[PDB]
Design a protein around this ligand. Structure first.
Ligand SMILES: *P(=O)(O)OCC(C)(C)[C@@H](O)C(=O)NCCC(=O)NCCS
Lengths: 50, 50, 72, 135, 134
DNA sequence: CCACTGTTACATTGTAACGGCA
DNA sequence: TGCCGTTACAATGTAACAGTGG
C-alpha cells in the first residue's frame, strides 16, 4: 500500500508540475507579444490617419 | 507628385492592415482559450505572473 | 447579417455570452471590456466590414447599440 | 543563427523523419546484413519516447547517405515552424500552367529577382496604372 | 468523360491509397470491433496484385465516410497521370509570400479570372506598357 | 577553407469547392 | 443527383544558391 500510494503521489506531482510548466510559459509569451504588437499598431494607425 | 506620395500612403496602409489583422487574430484566440478554460485552471495555475 | 455579425464579433472579441450581448449592453460595464479590450473590439469591428473609423467618432462608440448605429 | 534551436523538438522531428523513411522502405541503417539492420530499427522504435537518445542512434546506425537530406529537411521544418506563427511570414503554395510559369520564370531570370519579387513588380505596375486612373 | 480509366492501374492506385491510409492510422473499415477491422485489413494486405477483388473488397468493407475522399483522390491522380505526359500540360507549383499571394488573389477574385489567367493578363499588360514606352 | 543556416523553387500527394453534363 | 474535370490550396521533402562565423 505504501509503495502504491507513493508512486501515485509522485506521478500526480510530476504530471501537474510539468504540465503547468509546459503551458503557462507559452501562454505568458503569447500575452507579451500580443501587448507588444498592439503597442506597435497604434502608432502606425495614428500616422496613417493624417 | 500626389500619386507618388499616395503610393507610400498605400504601403503604410498595407502595413497597418497586416498588423491590425494579426492583433485581432491574437485577441480572438486568447478569448477562445479563456472561454475553453472555464474549468477554473486559469486563475492562478495558468496565469503564473512570475 | 450586420446586426448579428456585430454580436459575433463582440462575443468572440470579449468572450461574453451571446445572450449577454443585447443592443443596449455597454461594453465596459455590462461586457466588462476595458481600455485595451475595447480597442481590440473596435479593431475587429473595423476588420470585419473592411472599413475605417475616425478616432473621436470611434471612441464615441461605447455600447452595442452605438456600435451597430455607426456600423449600419 | 537566426532561429532558436530547440533540442527536444528537433530530436522528435528527427525521430519522426527516420521512422517515416523506414516505413517508406528506404534503408536508413548503414548495415547491409538483415539482422543487424532489423535490430537497429527495433531499437530506434523503442526510442520513440526518448528523443535524446535518437542523436546517438543516428551516430551509431544512420545510413551515411542521409546526412545531407536530414540536415536539409529539419532545417526547412524549423524555418516553416517558426514562420507559421504569423500570417505575414507564412508562405502560400500555388500551381501554374507550364506556359505561364515558363514566361514568368524567364522574366524573373531576366530581372534577376525571385518569383515573389517579380510578381510584386508586376502587380505594382498594374496598381500604378489603377492609381493614376483613380487619382 | 475525358480521360479513359484503366482498371489494372486505378485499382493499384486504390490499393496503395488504402494501405497508406491504414499505415497512417485512418480507420479503413466500417467495423468498430478491432478484430473484424484487423481481419479485413489483413485480407486487403494479402489482396495485393488484384484489381477485380480489391474493387469488391472496397464495396464490402470500405468505411462509408472515406468514399468521397477516395473518389476525388483517384480523380486527381488520373488527371495528373494523363497530364504528366507532355510538358505543356504539366503544372508548375511555386510558393508565394503571403502579402503577394493576398494581392494576387484579390485581383483574381475581383476580375473573375484564375491565377494563371490573371498572371497571363498582367504580364501581357506589362509587355504592352513596355512597347508603349518603347 | 569549411561547416552550418536561411531562402527559393520546385515536386509529390491529398482535399474541398465549383461547375459541366447524363 | 452523382460522376468527372478543374482549381487552389496544405504539408512535407530536396536541390540549389547565398550568407555567416569559426
Ligand atoms: P487603456 O486604459 O489601456 O487605454 C489604451 C489607450 C486608449 C490609451 C490606447 O488604446 C490608445 O488609444 N493609445 C493612443 C492614444 C492616441 O490617441 N494617440 C495618438 C496617436 S499615436
Amino acid at each position: 500500500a505504501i509503495r502504491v500510494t507513493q508512486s501515485d503521489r509522485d506521478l500526480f506531482k510530476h504530471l501537474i508540475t510539468e504540465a503547468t510548466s509546459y503551458v503557462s510559459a507559452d501562454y505568458m509569451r503569447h500575452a507579451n507579444e500580443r501587448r507588444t504588437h498592439l503597442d506597435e499598431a497604434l502608432a502606425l494607425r495614428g500616422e496613417l490617419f493624417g | 507628385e500626389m500619386e507618388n506620395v499616395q503610393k507610400k500612403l498605400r504601403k503604410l496602409e498595407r502595413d497597418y492592415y497586416q498588423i491590425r489583422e494579426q492583433v485581432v487574430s491574437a485577441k480572438a484566440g486568447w478569448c477562445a482559450v479563456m472561454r475553453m478554460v472555464k474549468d477554473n485552471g486559469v486563475e492562478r495555475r495558468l496565469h503564473r505572473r512570475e | 447579417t450586420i446586426e448579428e455579425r456585430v454580436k459575433k464579433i463582440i462575443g468572440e472579441q470579449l468572450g461574453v455570452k451571446q445572450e449577454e450581448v443585447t443592443n443596449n449592453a455597454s461594453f465596459v460595464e455590462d461586457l466588462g471590456a476595458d481600455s485595451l479590450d475595447t480597442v481590440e473590439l473596435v479593431m475587429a469591428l473595423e476588420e470585419e466590414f473592411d472599413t475605417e473609423i475616425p478616432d473621436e467618432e470611434a471612441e464615441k462608440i461605447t455600447t452595442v447599440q452605438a456600435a451597430i448605429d455607426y456600423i449600419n | 543563427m537566426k532561429y532558436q534551436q530547440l533540442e527536444n523538438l528537433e530530436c522528435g522531428w528527427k525521430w519522426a523523419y527516420l521512422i517515416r523513411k523506414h516505413q517508406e522502405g528506404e534503408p536508413i541503417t548503414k548495415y547491409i546484413e538483415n539482422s543487424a539492420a532489423h535490430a537497429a530499427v527495433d531499437k530506434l522504435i523503442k526510442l520513440e519516447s526518448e528523443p535524446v537518445r535518437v542523436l546517438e542512434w543516428i551516430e551509431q546506425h544512420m545510413n551515411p547517405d542521409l546526412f545531407n537530406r536530414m540536415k536539409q529537411t529539419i532545417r526547412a521544418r524549423r524555418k516553416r515552424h517558426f514562420n507559421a506563427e504569423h500570417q505575414h511570414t507564412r508562405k502560400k503554395s500555388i500551381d501554374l500552367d507550364f506556359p505561364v510559369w515558363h514566361r514568368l520564370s524567364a522574366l524573373s531570370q531576366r530581372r534577376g529577382n525571385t518569383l515573389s519579387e517579380t510578381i510584386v513588380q508586376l502587380i505594382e505596375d498594374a496598381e500604378r496604372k489603377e492609381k493614376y486612373a483613380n487619382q
